Amino acid sequence: PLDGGRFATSDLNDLYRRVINRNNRLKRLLDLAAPDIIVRNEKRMLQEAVDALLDNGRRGRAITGSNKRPLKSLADMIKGKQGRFRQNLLGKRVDYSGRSVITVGPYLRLHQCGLPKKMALELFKPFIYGKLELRGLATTIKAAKKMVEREEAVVWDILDEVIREHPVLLNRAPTLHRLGIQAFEPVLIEGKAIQLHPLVCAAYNADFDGDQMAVHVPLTLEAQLEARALMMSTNNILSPANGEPIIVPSQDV
Amino acid sequence: DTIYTAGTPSGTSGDYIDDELPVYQGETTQTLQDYLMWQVELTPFSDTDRAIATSIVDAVDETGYLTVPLEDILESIGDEEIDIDEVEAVLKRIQRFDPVGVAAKDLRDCLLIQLSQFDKTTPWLEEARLIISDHLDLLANHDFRTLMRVTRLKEDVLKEAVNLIQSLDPRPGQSIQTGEPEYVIPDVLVRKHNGHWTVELNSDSIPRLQINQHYASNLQDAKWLIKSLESRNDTLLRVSRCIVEQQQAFFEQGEEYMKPMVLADIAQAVEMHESTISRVTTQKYLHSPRGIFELKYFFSSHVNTEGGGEASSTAIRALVKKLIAAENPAKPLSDSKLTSLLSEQGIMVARRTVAKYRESLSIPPSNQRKQ
Amino acid sequence: YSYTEKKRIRKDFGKRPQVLDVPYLLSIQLDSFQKFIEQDPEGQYGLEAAFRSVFPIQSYSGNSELQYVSYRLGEPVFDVQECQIRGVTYSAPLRVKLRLVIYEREAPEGTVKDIKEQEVYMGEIPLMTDNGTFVINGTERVIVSQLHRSPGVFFDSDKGKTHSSGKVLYNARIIPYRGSWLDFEFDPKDNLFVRIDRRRKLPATIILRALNYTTEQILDLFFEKVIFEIRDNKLQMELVPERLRGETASFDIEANGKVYVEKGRRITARHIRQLEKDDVKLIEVPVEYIAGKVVAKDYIDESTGELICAANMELSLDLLAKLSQSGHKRIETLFTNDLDHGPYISETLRVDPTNDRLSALVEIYRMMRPGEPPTREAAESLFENLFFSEDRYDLSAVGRMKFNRSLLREEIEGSGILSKDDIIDVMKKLIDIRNGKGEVDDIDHLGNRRIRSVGEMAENQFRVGLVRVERAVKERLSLGDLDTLMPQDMINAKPISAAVKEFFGSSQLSQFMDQNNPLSEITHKRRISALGPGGLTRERAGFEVRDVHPTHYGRVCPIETPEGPNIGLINSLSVYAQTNEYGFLETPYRKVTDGVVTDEIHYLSAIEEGNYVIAQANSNLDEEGHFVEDLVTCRSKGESSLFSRDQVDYMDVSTQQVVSVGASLIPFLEHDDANRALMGANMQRQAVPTLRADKPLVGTGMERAVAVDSGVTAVAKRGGVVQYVDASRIVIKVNEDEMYPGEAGIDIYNLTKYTRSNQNTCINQMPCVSLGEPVERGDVLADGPSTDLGELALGQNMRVAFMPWNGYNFEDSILVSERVVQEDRFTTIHIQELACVSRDTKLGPEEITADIPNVGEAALSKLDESGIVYIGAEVTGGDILVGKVTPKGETQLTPEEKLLRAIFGEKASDVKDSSLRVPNGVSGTVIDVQVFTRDGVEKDKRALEIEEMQLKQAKKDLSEELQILEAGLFSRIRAVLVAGGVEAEKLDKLPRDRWLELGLTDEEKQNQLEQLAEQYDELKHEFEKKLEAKRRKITQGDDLAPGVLKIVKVYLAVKRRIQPGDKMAGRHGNKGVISKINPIEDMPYDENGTPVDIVLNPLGVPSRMNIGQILETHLGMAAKGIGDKINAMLKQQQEVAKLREFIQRAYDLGADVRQKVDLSTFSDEEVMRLAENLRKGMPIATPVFDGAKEAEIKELLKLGDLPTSGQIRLYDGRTGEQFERPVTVGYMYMLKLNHLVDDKMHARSTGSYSLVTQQPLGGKAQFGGQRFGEMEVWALEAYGAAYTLQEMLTVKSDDVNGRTKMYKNIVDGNHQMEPGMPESFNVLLKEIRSLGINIELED
């Protein structure tokens, strides 16, 4: 859809229109009983149109629509790095996720991370709705939504209550080994940057010169127990490739 | 051929990284029904209550009013144990969602629903409630006198109650409206120079395609499309130019100067089938210094002229508007008096035609315009 | 020193003399565009060449023609500032004069029947501003230069990688400036092959045949003849000794009765020398020797008339007997030796099937035009148009020059079309290369790569448009009434304008200018990109092109290059680099004649530079110029070594002619790792300007050049005295001698105040001159962004200590004091623009008003009567800026609608709200509103107020000029009256109007009075006319896009502070993130109780190898120390003598510096102002490769009474206990990079999803989610968390019902999921099924 209420046909629609036009012309010529010398080239062109629709560019010249750019076909939709398999099925974007820069907190304990509260309000919102409804502060969903929108003085106490023991997953790209995703317990801080324990950076290959991190929230009870029992930062002292410790002091320590 | 001396920039980079942009997919949006259903899901209903709620929210228009009566909904449920009181309870529950007052049968119901959610400390609440509940047409018709008799209230309290009434929301469902409205690009432009109206197609809308003929059949077929486009735009330009020539007086002196021309005139002037004229002028607009007008706007009916000729219905409508616009508030003009007044300038239109024109222009009759 | 440099003189530690001054940094753009525009009588550069290339145009009948005469560019309608404010291109109209001539018939040649001349319009050409930038649609743009392969002929080869035998294949490619390429290639079987436009391979001899050549001619061309004689006995031969080199005898070499070489014995050089000495010609060779010799020319017997044999054929015994018996005593053969003189052409002819002229041409036509039957005439026409038609194939002047140079010719001039001789010589040189003689070319050589600038590209695009215009013109010119038509009717302006604006606005090489600071602009303008049309690609580049070449020395910066996929493909010009008249980079060198280094400067290119010996700038010299040592380090032929004194030819001009500007702005560069130098140079240009600029305490002396040559500071056009200085304008009264006649001499400089840059930063100029003080031509009057008294200033000087502090500077973190925040040192201003457009609709014109129906009075408080917010209003998210109502619709209505209209008004039922609101999460103060209304529409109060504000300034300027002129005239009238013997006191007391209310005597006095009255009234009328013209310009209506009524633009300004998470850096590649804002009483403090500002980690210095920063710190401290001393001499009123003595002692310090400062030439006021400027620290300059030694730093530390080691004793702020070891404290220049944590932070719980795959969108601007790629899935699989993965895959991304059920259960305090099927899998199933393949689930 362009501006002005008009539309432009995409690649698949273009190829469909082309094959339809060729088929209609060939059918009309067949009804007319035209000389065969013409129906031969018409059938050849219809064959080429169908081949271009199914897999464009495999045989002969690739058909382009504009700016000398080849038109995507069904095969190109299926295959490649941009196809369904490697872009929407083996990896996908998710909800309840955030990202920001990371700083150093030298006071944290090994199972703790520092989370800005403006991020925690957004990530944990439905839990806040449920907790607000539970104690009668909002009899309806719209009242709780309005109260959270206004950022009243009690939603902060509610937020402190709902994240007491609820791990979050921290991730930094590229994830080269299984220690690139680790679960921590949140501590609400004032600011806009995540605070990271100094002893885990060597596992993340992370330094504080502009690195960013992503944070995800488990939802079900099984996910929370997996985060606490499998992915917690206190369960990853030894390396799965060596058996040697990776939670090791370096530099100033 | 002029250059726009001011404009707005586009927020983007001039050049993009050479990789191809991903195919267009789209993006979901939240209309009124989506919000209402979201609130429905998070509400402690039973299963039958949820089915009735889905059926009800299905039948809510853009403004937030319930378009179908409850009998239709109860029939659409398809069960026989369910009565109408359950439907009433579900509707009352739904009407208190956000925005308050949605899915209301009529204006009185919407106003009462909005009023029921106030606090008793409000200065004049019961007066407003009574006025809405019983005497509504009095407030709409600007009586202000028999309302004082029935309400047994002095001036100040009634005025404050009306102030409270005009503080509510009559269209509660339009708070969640569409993002940004569409706009139409004109096809042809009519400027004026040398005391004449020049007609020219929109340059910004007509590019010339690059001729792909180098790999050379297909070349001949491609040129066929070029010739077809040439003939199409030539026909459009000829029709528009002829129409502009016929309606020169309107472009200069505005309304009240159109001519009663039909498709036959254009067909005989351009020597073409009238079906083609009907086809080409459909859903196409022309931009004039006076505004933007559909290319089919200049065709209308006519009325007999005493001295000779015909008068455009558009001219009659404009004359009626200008006559009404300068009437005395004490005694507004009536239909018969309007017909008598117009029957001095050669205008011969029946009272029924005057009534039809007045209804088309959406002007209340004389008794509702008296001050 | 200039006046602006006498205020604060930067101490210089450099030691080598300067012989060439740093040139203008923007010559590459300005000279190129000036070449494009300016008239050229020779007609080789610019629009003249393009016009002459296509014209004259003659119709097919040849009965008429168009003749271009000349052209002209008009005056721009607007100015740069006006174009930027409005948002239109700053361009000029192109007016070209043509002449149409009509021919007749039945007459010899062409008679002149009618000639019609007309001046026509061809389009708008954008113009270049004074800073080498273009204003296209309101935004400044830069067209960067291209580095492309030059036209000509190049010889290359593959390194055996194409054949498994590892045999190298050689090829020669001819690439023109415009036309079709040509390729000659060798195959593994040694057969020459030809190729056109990368099409099918063809035999090489086809080209020879197509040029009317015979086989005998070819064999004569490519071979050396050998003549066999039959002197009635056994074919006696005329032998030459040199031909026998490398040959092994197969017969007996005997002559004059002496056997020189015996049968079977290899021929040696001694035998050849003996044969040369003896002069042996007659050699008897057996018939057996003719086993394989190939005849040259066809032979026929006289009596028979038939052919003995055909050419290019080996001779046999029977054929030898047949020719001998046929009276043949002379035969011709070819010399085909193995080691040299190889037989490649003969075998090429053998494989070649064609043996004529036409069949080869038909084959060429079939190859280039397959799918159709051939034609003789069509094939001939195609071949002629291929390489010899001026309309299709052109070899440019540089192409011809390179072509001739590659073939060792003498002349330079030539034709752009090819000839037989050129192709023959190309094949000859290729064959010679195959035979071990000669060598291939190096493509990365900067003698093979050319610089293409904006003018050349614009000229090419203009020609491309002009050829289409010619194609259109040739049609109308064929037939028509030759009288009533005009040249205007034939041309069509649309293609030219379309092509030109497309090139200037949507090309690959046209980009938005970087506007973080002046350095960004300077660096962006001086850029060389190998990409773009006609260039390389990020995928077909290779690996050798991405590396430093020895020819880059002095032309292209080796350091500055972008890391990432574009490494090595983007370059920045060096300080002194220029271009040839052909486009090859060149660098300057001093000429050394007879061992004495002169001051004569020569510019050498890459090719010429290799044939000399070039010394180094580091070499020491005597006062008269001789070298001081017998051995000198010099470069020669790509190597570097030692040479004698007399061997040297040239010498470098500066130690900094190798680095670029950004790299030359780094102090102590030679002590830094190259990677750290590159990182520092890249980060130095991303620093946002701050509230108050601060000079660098340690610099390199390149600050002033970058500041002045950037265009961000107002520089005086002429000298004079500051008549009127204000925070928004400057008015200079020009000196008498520089004034033009008949002119009130004043310059008016309007400063720009708080305008928006391309990166939403602030551009603001501040005056830096006082009232009534002298200024000379070239001085700086105003400071732009990041500038202090004309010196570039990107950051702030901070007191820094190197020590670990409780882990708050662990792993490159930075600990910052709170006093830094309390003083707004790193506080920036950011400016944003939002626009609202009211246009026309089919239901009515969209209106701007404050009478919005369904909005309460509270939200309408800040709007005025017109519906636009007041100036200075503070707004936040959701506030209404401009109120706009859109007509909702029109219907037949209904009783409920009538009731609604009756109760709640008519306007509330006719329109709906569409106002402009501040986006969520945005704040600022409204500092500017601009309104543009279409012509003919009635204006509103806001627009009228703005127009009055605009008119006031023009009236003020005109009044200033007029009043100065009137005072000048009144001086003369008063002087004339006084010379007339008038009552002087009476006229002194009379007002200046009463002076005109008088009369003079009947002598010439009355004539003078009349003359001056005439002049007075004429001047008044003229300036009234000027005022009326400017009022017409200001009050002019606006022509907008059709259907658009009004446009309103609003500007917001906000201030940003420093906080944890922001990124800071130095100039030595030491970046970091602020981690904590420590309170003031916690920072470490020295003996005097002065705290430190920033604490860094020492461990980061040795592991990064950027030692220079440490050095800077030490030197920085020294500088600060000096300031303290001076400051102490000012708090107590010390007299000027001691102040100037100490300042002179400080300036004289050093070991043979090149700067001589003499303060005895300074008046006491100048000395006091210099001390006032120096009281905060004496700035110091250290050139890149001629910096300050450690001994000089130690001496400077001693002068300021500071410890020489550079380390002091600090104390703990929390416990008062001394740290156990001395700590390094100093002053370092810190920047604030444009990576603010306000932009990075983002979170999302639920939003909008894609329409097809039903997955969340991506990006902060779309309010999207974080991607969970394949590798995170692998990590979760490795952990074994199946439930986390399952809820990542279905209920958070794609399970359409799963999302809703999960949300509902979460609200209810029940944490449990009911997963389903992702929608992307169903999409995949549908897409696979659409291929005609049945895939399904089962059971």
Ligand SMILES: Nc1ncnc2c1ncn2[C@@H]1O[C@H](COP(=O)(O)OP(=O)(O)OP(=O)(O)O)[C@@H](O)[C@H]1O
């Ligand atoms: N093309 C890339 N693909 C994947 N990861 C990359 C790529 N380029 C950089 N990285 C990541 O960036 C990291 C580099 O970190 P950073 O830029 O902070 O500097 P550093 O290597 O720690 O050194 P220093 O801070 O001392 O200059 C790498 O360890 C790697 O994880």
Ligand SMILES: Nc1ncnc2c1ncn2[C@@H]1O[C@H](COP(=O)(O)OP(=O)(O)O)[C@@H](O)[C@H]1O
């Ligand atoms: N291509 C990349 N992929 C993943 N991480 C990267 C990449 N480039 C840089 N990073 C990481 O992100 C951090 C911030 O990078 P950024 O500041 O954008 O790069 P630069 O410092 O070169 O401008 C760096 O510390 C680096 O470790």
Ligand SMILES: [Mg+2]
């Ligand atoms: Mg990093």
